[PDB]
Every structure is written in structure tokens, then in C-alpha cells.
Amino acid sequence: KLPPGWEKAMSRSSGRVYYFNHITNASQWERPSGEPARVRCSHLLVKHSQSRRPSSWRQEKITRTKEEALELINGYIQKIKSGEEDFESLASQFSDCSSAKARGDLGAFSRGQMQKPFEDASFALRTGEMSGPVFTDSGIHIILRTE
Ligand SMILES: Cc1csc(C(N)=O)c1
Ligand SMILES: Cc1csc(C(N)=O)c1
Numbered sequence: 001k002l003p004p005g006w007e008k009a010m011s012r013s014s015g016r017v018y019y020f021n022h023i024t025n026a027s028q029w030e031r032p033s034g035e036p037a038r039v040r041c042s043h044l045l046v047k048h049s050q051s052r053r054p055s056s057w058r059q060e061k062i063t064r065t066k067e068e069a070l071e072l073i074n075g076y077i078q079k080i081k082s083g084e085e086d087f088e089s090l091a092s093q094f095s096d097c098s099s100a101k102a103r104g105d106l107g108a109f110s111r112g113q114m115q116k117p118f119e120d121a122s123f124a125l126r127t128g129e130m131s132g133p134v135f136t137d138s139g140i141h142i143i144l145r146t147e
Contacts (some may be wrong), residue, residue, distance in 0.1 A: 005124045006032045023124040024143070025132030033126060040147035041122045042087065042104035046072050047096040047139035056096035066140075073133045073140045080130065080142070087130065087144050096139060108147065118143065 002008075005023035010016075020027045047054055047062045048069035054062040064072075076094065079085040091104030099106055111119055115136040125131060125145035134141040 003032050003034065003124075003126070021124065021132075024121040024129075025134060026125075026130065027132060035123055038108045038110050039122050039125070039145055040108040041106055041125075042091060042144045042146060043097065043099065043106060043118070044073075044076060044087065044091040044095040044104055044142040045097040045139050046070075046076075046094070046141075051096075051139045052137040057098055057100065058094070058096055062096065069140050070133055073142060077130075077132065077142060087142070091142075104144070105146070 002019070005021040006019055007022065009018055009020045011018055016029065018027060018029050019032055021032070046069040047056055048064050048066045049062060050066055051062060056062060076085070076090050080087050080090065088103035092100055095104055097104070111123065113119070114122065115138065117134055117136050118141060121131045121134045121143050122145060125143065127145055127147060129145055131141070131143040134143055
């Protein structure tokens with residue numbers, strides 16, 4: 001029916017159908033459009049106190065809870081989707097990954113290199129597409145597939 005990971009859902013607040021991807025946690029009103037050796041992705045990471053290292057260039061000791069990290073991620077996604085902020089700008093300012101200094105760009109990678117939920121979401125995104133919150137042992141990610 002739909003591309004890998006996508007399913008129909010019902011808006012609780014509006015009653016309109018929408019589409020949700022259970023690999024990428026992307027959600028959108030529009031029906032999804034229409035695998036490679038490598039993809040290229042950027043990401044914005046928000047770490048939390050349960051991260052496998054709760055420390056970053058932004059903060060020596062990351063103390064925010066997982067729930068607080070998710071609320072930050074949710075807010076960044078809202079600003080990206082509304083156009084108020086660009087993904088690259090938010091990643092440079094707020095990603096707890098050292099790749100923040102490269103606007104979140106991780107370069108290209110194959111399957112079997114990244115943490116699995118990140119890999120699966122990255123490969124389920126089409127070029128240009130953005131994930132919803134993706135959970136790994138590092139923290140919570142917004143992933144943007146660029147190639
Ligand atoms: C909403 C929510 C996200 S993480 C979380 C928890 N209890 O760790 C709750
Ligand atoms: C992919 C990447 C670019 S900068 C960086 C770092 N400095 O750790 C990671």
C-alpha cells in the first residue's frame with residue numbers, strides 16, 4: 001500500500017486521516033510519496049540523564065530527564081515544521097552531538113555502522129525527509145536525510 005513503515009491513522013483532535021511511520025516516527029497529513037547502499041543524514045541529538053554518556057559540548061553534566069528531552073525534541077520539530085527555524089540552525093545551536101559544529105551532518109553511512117534505531121529510521125527516510133523523535137542509547141534524535 002504505502003512506503004516502508006507507513007500506516008494510516010486518525011487524528012484525535014480533527015478526525016482527519018493522517019500518515020504515521022513507525023520506523024521514523026514521522027507523521028504528516030499528506031499521503032507518503034511513492035534501498036541504497038548508503039545514506040547521508042544530519043541529526044539533532046538531545047541527550048538526557050539516561051544517555052549512554054550524559055555529557056556533551058553543551059553541558060558537562062546532562063541532567064534533564066528523558067521526558068524533558070522529548071519535550072525539547074517535540075518543540076524543535078514544531079519550529080522546523082512551521083518554518084520558524086531551520087533544522088541546521090537548531091542542530092548547530094542545540095544538538096548534544098559534536099556534529100552540531102557541522103550543522104548536524106554525519107556524512108554518509110551504511111547499514112551496520114550506526115545504532116540500530118537510528119540506522120532503521122535513516123534508511124526509511126526518503127531524501128529530503130525528516131524523522132520524528134528517534135530513540136537510541138545516545139538520547140533522542142531528529143534525523144534529516146540529505147542524500
Ligand atoms: C512522555 C514520556 C517520554 S519519556 C517518559 C518517561 N517516563 O521516561 C515519559
Ligand atoms: C560527523 C561529525 C562532524 S564534526 C564531528 C565531531 N567533531 O565529533 C562529527
